[PDB]
Structure 1
Amino acid sequence: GSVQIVYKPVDLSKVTSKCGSLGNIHHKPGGGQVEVKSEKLDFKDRVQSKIGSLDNITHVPGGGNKKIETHKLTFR
């Protein structure tokens, strides 16, 4: 009459976040012809423009991970 306890849990698990712009291909983006001719134009107020530009913009407030483990063994 004897007690043998083996407490041997194995964790090979993954917790993962892939957040934003991942693993894309962009092949020859742009590549065209852009012509702008502008004459006698007038602006009374704030203005912003993009002519022929290429913009990639990524914001990631998210993608956080939380792991909690409890491994309690009680013998009496």
Structure 2
Amino acid sequence: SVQIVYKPVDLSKVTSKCGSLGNIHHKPGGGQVEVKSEKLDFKDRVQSKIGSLDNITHVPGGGNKKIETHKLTFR
């Protein structure tokens, strides 16, 4: 005989209050970029990125995160 009771209770709270949020300024890559190449030999795969790439401004009002995992394994 085997009896297993799995009764986790979650009454938790993840909250945030922000009176005002803003005046955010993100300016990447305002400088001049010059790339001058001459007599280059590439014998394999080439990946090149020039300029302003993949810059992120992320401004969530809350941005609160809850991660919870439940696992019952029986053998």
TM-score of the superposed pair, with normalisation by structure 2:
0.44
Q: Distance in 2 between matches of 1:18 and 1:43?
A: 55
Shift in alpha-carbon separation, 1:25–1:40, aligned structure 2, 3 A: same
* 8 Å Cα contact 1:16-1:65 kept in structure 2: yes
The structure where strand makes up a greater share of residues is 1
Bigger drift between 23-32 and 42-51 goes to 42-51
CA contact (8 A) 1:20 1:60 kept: no
Hey, which bits of structure 1, 4+ residues long, moved more than 4 A?
A: 21-62
Aligned position for 1:10: 9
Say whether the 8 Å CA contact 1:20–1:59 is kept in structure 2: no
Q: Where do 5+ consecutive residues of structure 2 fail to align? A: none
Rg comparison, structure with higher value: 1
Aligned residues: 75
Q: CA deviation at 1:19?
A: 1.0
**What is the root-mean-square deviation in Å for CA atoms of aligned residues?**
12.2
3-state secondary structure, aligned to 1:36: strand
Aligned mates of 2:39, 2:74 — CA distance in 1:
89
Aligned CA distance change for structure 1 residues 42 and 8 (closer, same or farther; 3 Å): closer
Structure 2 CA distance for partners of 1:30 and 1:10, relative to 1, 3 Å? same
Identity within the alignment, %: 100
Provide TM-score, normalisation by structure 1.
Answer: 0.43
Q: Flag the 1:3–1:66 CA change in 2: closer, same or farther, 3 A.
A: same
